[PDB]
Structure formats: C-alpha cells, structure tokens
Symmetry: D2
Subunit: 288 residues, 4 copies
C-alpha cells in the first residue's frame, strides 16, 4: 500500500522572464499549460499525469525554487504529518485552499537546508487527455516537445543535509536509497530519499548556501526518448549542461539542461526498484 | 511511503520434470538459482532483486500454481493483516519459519477463486550480485538468458472475482487500477490490482474453474529487451503464445510463452504510474480485443 | 561504388477509393504528398527521401500493383540496361518523360511472373525539407503519422520465380541474399534480391496467380518506431495482419497492415549488411 | 549493384603493448580473434562480418595507423583500379598474397595526406559464427563485450585533403556525402566519402601532420547498444573521449573512446541513406568547430 506522502506534487520555480518561460516550457519541454492565476503564475502538468499541475513558474528578479510540494494520501494524513512536523520541533504554516489554483490547503515548513517544503492532500484531477474508457496508450501530446511523463523529483543544495535526512525518514516516511560519503570523514555529502518504490522522490547535496535548487527532474519513457529530447534541445538552442549519459547514482540515463532563466532541469529514464526494506547503496567521495 | 503489503514475494509453481524446469528457468528465462531444499524444490530469483527467492518450482503430477505470496512491511504488519483477514471471515493458516528455505513464517489463506495466498515479513536478503559500494550499472547476469528484473505479478483464473476484489481492496490495501467490464448488466470480468504505484501487482479474471494460473510475469528493462526475449525463446524452441506486442490494458508491451510443463509466463515492460488517489480505467467487453492486443 | 540499378524508385498501387487513400497514406502512414496529375494520380515520397516520388496511388476497380520502378545511375546506364534486357529475350517499352509527374523516360517490361517493372534514370530531386547547410537534427515531419524513411522494397507473388531470378541477377545486377528452398524440388520457393548492400530491394515468392502483390515495404529507424507504428495503426483502426515481430529471413523487425483498399504494406527496420561477394543464406521449406 | 570498391576491408593499427591490446580488443570491444602470424600480428573481425579480418594490431614504438584497406568486387577490378591509380599519377606497390594471413595480394599507395590505402579482392570467408541454413538473428558473440557488427570507416587527419578527394571520387568511385566548409576562404576543411549507400566509408580532416589517425569506427545495432557500450567502457576503466552523444555530420549517435595504446575508436549507430545521385550536405566551419572531429577538442 502507498500511504502517507505519496509523490512529488509540485515545484514552483522563479523565472526572470515569464512570457519566455511559458514559451520554453510549452514548446521545448512540452509541459501542458493548465492555468494562470491573478499573481501571474502559470501552471503546467506533464501529459500523462492526472492532477492539475506539477510545475509552476513565477516571474521574479531571481531564479531558483520558491518551494517543492508533495501530495499525501488524504486529509487525515495531512493533519497527522502537520502535528508530527510540529512535535518534531519544526514550525508549520498553513496555506489556504485556492491560494494556488485547483489546490487544497497546504502545510508548509522550512528545512535546515533552507528549502521550503509543502504537503497537500487535494488537487483537482483534470485527467491525462485520454479517455477513461478503452484508453489509448498515448495521443498527440506525447509528441509535442520533449513531453515528459511526470515530475520525478528534484535535487536540492543546502547546508544541513544530516538533519534534513532525519526529518524525512523520521517524520515523512521516506527512506535512504543511495548516498555519497564524504572524504572518509564519513558524513553523507549527498542523499537520495524515496517515499515509494522509486529510486528517489527527492535528493539533497550538502552545500554552504541554503535554499539552492540544483534541478527539477522529469521522467521520460525510454533511452530513445532521451535521445530525442537531446535533438529537440539542440534544435531550440537550449543550453545543455551535461549531455546524455549514464548516471552512476540511480543508474539514470539523463540530460541536464538550463531553461531561459538559468534553472537547471533533467529529462531522464531508468533506475532500479527499491522498497522500504532495502538497505541503501553508497558511493565513495572519490567516485562522487 | 510504501506500507502494509509491499509487493509480490514469491510464486511456487508445479512442473512435470524438475530437471528440465531447472535448465529452462536458469538458462532460458535467466533466473538465478539460489537454493534447493529437502522437499525437492529449487529456488530462483531475478538477478536484480535482493531477497533469496521469488520463484520456486516443484515436480508434481500436474502443472499449475500452488501458491502466490506477498512480502509485507514488517512483522507487526504481518500479525496485523492476519488479524484483519480473520476478522473479515477468512480462516488463516500459519506456516512456520524455515518451512521454506531462507524464509520466515507466512500467513496463508485461500481465496474465493480457489487460489492460495501467503503474506510474510521475512525473507533473507542476498543482494543483486553487485557491490553495495560504488556499484556498476549492471553485470554479466543481466545478459544470462532473458534475465528479467523482478517478479512483477501474476494473473489468476478463478470464480467470484467480485469477492476477491473486496478482500484485496478492503483488507490488504490494494486498489483497482483497471478493469474489463462484462457485457451489458455490468460487473467486472477482469481486474488489475495494485498495492503500490505499479499498474498491477496481481490480476484476476472471472473463470468457472478455480485455482487456475494464467501466468506469472517478469519485468524487463526496455522494448528491445522484449525483442531479445523473443529471439532467445526461438533459439531454445520455446512455445510462444502471443508474440511481442502491446496490451492496452496496462499499456504493457509483452510476450507470453510456455515453460516445459505448460506453465505460461510473461516478459514485459512499460505502463503508466497510478497512485491510490487515482480512479480506475475501464475497458468495454465489446472492445476486449484491443484491450488484450492493442496494435491488432 | 553503387552503379547500375541503384534502388527501388516507385510503386504505383491501385486503391478502391482515392479519398480514403489520400488520407490514410498522408496522415496514417505519414508519407508526404508531392503532387497530383491530370490523370487523377496522387504522388507521395517518404519525408527523408530526396526524389519527388516513391509511392503513387490510382483509383481503380481492383486493388494491387500496376508497376514497380527502379532508379538507375544515369542515362547511359538506362540505355545499357534496356539493350541488355532485349538482348536477353525480353520485349521493352519506352515511356516518355513527363508521362509521370517530375519523372524522365522509363524502360518497362513484364516478368515471367506477370509483374510490370520499370527502370528510370531521372526524377526531380525535391529534398527532405531540411536545409543543405547545417541541417537541424530533424523536423516535425519525423513525427507526422508513422513517417517512414524510404520505400524499402516490395514482395511479389507469381509463377516462374526461377526465371525471374535469372533476369535480375544476370541482366539487372542484383544478387541473391536469402532463399527459401522448396520441398525437395531443388527450386527456391522464395528469393530475396539485392542490388546494393541492403538485405533486399525486392523479393519474390512462387505463386499460381500472376502479377500479385504481397506488400510494399517502408523502413523505420528503430524497434521502438515499429512499436509506435503499431500504436498509430490501432488508433486509426487500421487492420493489422501480423503483429510487431521479427522475420527469420532478413532479421527484419516488422508489422504488416492493410490500407483501406486491401493493399498490404510493411513498416520494418533492422537486418544485416550483405555485399555482392557474400553467399546467400537458405531456409528449409519445413522451417518457413 | 555494388561495384568497384565495396567497403572498408581492414585497418592495421599500432599498439604499444601487444598483450594488453589483445585483451582490450577481444574482451572490451568484443572483436573476434581469427589468427596470429609469424610477424607477431593479431587479427580480429567483427562477429557479424564474414571475412577473416577487419582489424589488425601490431606491437610498435608508436601508436597510430599503418594502413587502411578496401575490399573490391573481384580480381579484374583490382587490376583495373591499379592501372587507373597509376594512370592518375600515383605510384602503387603490390603486396604479395599471404603476406597477410588469409589475404590475397593488395594494391598499396600513399595519399597526399600521408596515409597508406590498400585495395584487395580476396580474403578468406570464415562466416559470422551462425549457420548458413535456417540462420538465427544472432548468438552469444553478440553479447561478448561491446560486440560491434562491422568496421564502418575511419577518419584520417592530414594535409592536401583536396587532392585526396579528387583521388577517391575520380579514380576509386567514391562520392562526397558531407563536407565542412573553411572559415570563409572557402574550400573544404573536412570530407566524408562513400563508395556505397552509407553516409561514409572513409573521412578526412585537413591537418598539418601527415598520416594521422583520428579514429577507426565500429557500427552498433541500436541506440541502446550504444548506451550498453558506454556501460562496458565504464566497467573496464576505459578512457572515454566524448560520452554518448548525437553527432551531426552523420546524424550518428556515438561514443569516442581510446585504446590502451591511445588509439581512438568509435562505436556508433544511426545515419541516413545517401546514393550516388545525391548532392552533398555542408557544415559551416563554426559549426564544425563545436563538433567531435574538430582538431581542437
Ligand atoms: C549532483 C547530481 O546532479 C546527482 C544526481 C543523481 C541522480 O540520481 C539524477 O539526477 O537522476
Ligand atoms: C485480455 C486479457 O486477458 C488481459 C490482458 C492484460 C494484461 O495486463 C495481463 O495479462 O497482465
Ligand atoms: C513470403 C513471406 O511471407 C516472408 C517474407 C520475409 C521478409 O523478410 C519480408 O517480406 O521483408
Ligand atoms: Fe535528478
Ligand atoms: Fe501479465
Ligand atoms: Fe518486406
Ligand atoms: Fe566516425
């Protein structure tokens, strides 16, 4: 049974230029635009997802991540986690339903690494553009731009990863899948946590400046889709960070590229199938 | 988080000739043999899995499945589930630890469909044959025979699917991902159940005879692997049921073939990513064909 | 060097309904329409080919193939081939330039199996839509319907395949790549012929009826494009013959399906790389 | 019909250590060893090819390529080519048959770029390890190391590429498929030549030093095989030049890596289907400067 925290639900990122951000995410990445609110933020969802949104961009004077939200099983679970976060010593804030289009109230809190995390139980299901009866495997949207399958996770750069692990494993029901060791001084320089049977729903790398966003990740169907994504990036003049390649950690075959505003994102596929009862895999600093 | 029933743990199948069963499953399908007990049962597991076994064969008068077990989160969970099963009205049997090689105690019970289901919390962890520190992407095992990644699920044939569904969803925390409706005067002729975010961990099809096994399924990495599996089957003159194709119900790209004793198995990959908050997908009986084989 | 007969140039097929044929080939298979003549024929080419046409449709009262042409190196070669065919004992007809849109004169003749074959040295090159300078990876045409890369070959059914083989190898410059032996008759039941280094540019199977067409084939880029083609066929309710699979002969991974008129076409990829110095592979009849 | 020069036939490369060279080529790249002659050379062929050899290694003081040869249709063609090569103004030297294991005599000559090219019509056929009757699509060989399918081509670095182009297109029956234009004093800084319907059978890049070998190339079955090759390289600590990536000057998806001796080779798949009647594609120098075959890089 999947319970408690289910999956990454949304990432709100800052773009130095809205209209340009809308163009790149709609035509290059191929996210489906679902709405635009009064604040001027525009909502997107991957084609095969069913909820109203997973990626929200906001015009601002600085690039980066405002916050990262997770969907939880139900309202009861949301209330419990809220109380658990507080019992743990974290101060929670409650964002009202509607504050974000088609989204219920959210429980927000700040990690020691400086990042803002949200938890919510409700978000309107809009569907994946395919009928619920005798559904096709895909439709035209699958080939509009890169067209990723789902918001897979994000990797965050922050100062107190050690205590961040505790919050996630002891309060949020996540578990360590992989980690990178420090130079023998044995302190996880980085961690890959899962709250399902995926290699990771979120990751953290130890960093001096808090609240930094390394990248938001989008899942693709096959290695050939990663190849196609690279061609679309090239044809649209997208600034690529590190070309298509196999990633040691999580066995991911990915591509790192930057959007107009300088936000790094990933399109990948691959990875094993860990479960709560598995012991994490480790990587020596020299390998990292 | 993944709690309660985590995933398919093992399937013990009956084979006519134990020796050919070993050869086929070790050399053709590519399972890693991990043991043989005193009752004459050989233990296999997929190379990338970590637990001691997921597939166990036994020489018997007839082919088919003896039982299908699921691994649960923890002992407290095992005891808890066993309690709810009884409180539900199902009589449960307690199989002691060790009865199965490298396996802990299991909670076994029979379904309305006639199939025997087990629940267990402990199974020795042997690893995937790759190092725990700075692991390689894969190894030679990945190319020994078909070499599937995990026991994905199984599809069972038996009566009273409606009742079977209620047990899985109301007691074992599963949820319906897809169903194939009966003709008019609706009811479900087929159901695909998930206890995770996989399209299905197990499925049932309404059939008059009970305790029947349609197939056990093994997960592959890609579509090219599915074609490779096809070639390997041909090279070993393995009887293939439905060649490489797309399902529709699950979107799974697969191939069905038979082992030497007539037991159908499957090697596939693909599918979307359902979660418990999702509403099930429905297929009409009239459009059943496309649901079973999409391209055709 | 590639000389003599270079490659399959065009197949003109008969459709029971021009309208349904235009829609099917242009939007399901994803061929690119390049013209229509005052005779009511529609011209198509695969998007990545450079010549004006490779597949022509003509509304008639019966499905099937009218003729199949091959492009040769140059005019001198065309004349040479015409002379050799007649010196061989065959009667030739010369079709003038322009009888077919954007096409030069053609040399036509009938095979003992009843099929009409043509040879031509000139056909307007129109390009693949991509620039000849710094060509972008690929365009949108790549994903318009199935979108095959080239007319790969055709498979013809008819009698006297033995006589047909001699004409192609002794006169036209092809060589036998693969064969299916007949049941102790010491006469091949099927032949796969190449005039390049492709597994085959044309193939014949022994059959009582004369001039029959089994299928025209189109090449795809990968096994996954084959899966995609099947998906597209299902989506457009296309009637599929043999599901995605691998051919023993050629090693090709394919799908056979029918157009609205009952004409079988193929979408496949794969196969080894034979050369004129290679010996043919053989398949026992009992292992067809 | 495929006539005249048919395809790359063999490449003899120099390795600093004959032993580690044999292990790398039979275990990592997955080439099939077919022999070892008196001179100390070890011969290999790709599993799916049918002739005795396509890659030969020779222990030497320096790394690089000794010569690159093409197989021609038949003996008559070999004689004709030799005559046309001399008629053109090149001096040719006939290498005796048997000088190379299982290889007939060869017509050797030097290009203006300094590279030695050979032509031969006969080389013993040893098969691809698969039955000639009811042949399977592949076997264990396909999964031994990377296991390339064929010696696809090579890319040489040397001067006077203009004169090399003339020789290949006017005498050897090849044609230009792609080119890289010079910054502006227009000419060609790079050329990709074909003697078939492949994107290229051989390529040259204008470079001051004569006889330079950029890389020999090996063809793979699919994009996933390239990814696989990447994993095998990482596992064997192979020195990778430029990881899996989409080319451009061929639409190829490839990986450039090095021999333990420092010989660069390529494992790729992909590309379109040019024919003799086609006009070449062009790349601006500034584009080439960002590609994988740029002298700097
Ligand atoms: C520091 C860094 O980028 C590591 C990322 C790990 C992953 O598994 C992925 O990106 O899929
Ligand atoms: C027609 C039928 O029985 C269902 C086929 C779909 C499946 O996902 C399976 O068998 O695992
Ligand atoms: C006569 C028949 O059914 C088999 C044909 C084999 C092939 O490889 C093809 O058609 O490309
Ligand atoms: Fe990532
Ligand atoms: Fe199944
Ligand atoms: Fe065909
Ligand atoms: Fe190359």
């Amino acid at each position: 049974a999947m319970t408690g925290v289910l999956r990454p639900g949304h990432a709100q990122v800052r773009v130095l230029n809205l209209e340009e951000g809308i163009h790149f995410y709609r035509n290059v990445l191929g996210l489906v635009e679902t709405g635009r609110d009064d604040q001027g933020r525009v909502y997107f969802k991957c084609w095969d997802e069913r909820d109203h949104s997973c990626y929200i961009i906001r015009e601002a004077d600085t690039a980066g991540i405002d916050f990262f939200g997770f969907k939880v099983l139900d309202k009861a679970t949301l209330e419990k986690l809220d109380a658990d976060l507080q019992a743990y010593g974290l101060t929670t804030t409650r964002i009202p339903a509607g504050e974000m289009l088609e989204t219920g109230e959210r429980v927000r809190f700040e990690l020691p690494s400086g990042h803002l995390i949200e938890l919510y139980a409700e978000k309107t299901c809009v569907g994946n553009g395919i009928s619920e009866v005798n559904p096709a495997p895909w439709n035209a949207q699958r080939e509009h731009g890169i067209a990723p399958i789902q918001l897979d996770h994000c990797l965050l750069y922050g100062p107190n990863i050690a205590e961040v692990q505790k919050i996630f494993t002891e309060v949020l029901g996540f578990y360590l899948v992989e980690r990178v060791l420090s130079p023998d001084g044995d302190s996880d320089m980085g961690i890959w946590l899962s709250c399902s049977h995926k290699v990771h729903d979120i990751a953290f790398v130890e960093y001096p400046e808090k609240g930094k966003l390394h990248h938001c990740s989008f899942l693709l169907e096959s290695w050939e889709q990663v190849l196609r994504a690279g061609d679309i990036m090239s044809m649209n003049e997208v600034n690529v960070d590190i070309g298509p390649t196999r990633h040691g950690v999580t066995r991911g075959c990915t591509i790192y590229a930057w959007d107009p505003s300088g936000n790094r994102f990933e399109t990948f596929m691959g990875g094993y199938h860990p479960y709560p009862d598995y012991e994490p895999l480790s990587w020596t600093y020299d390998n990292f």
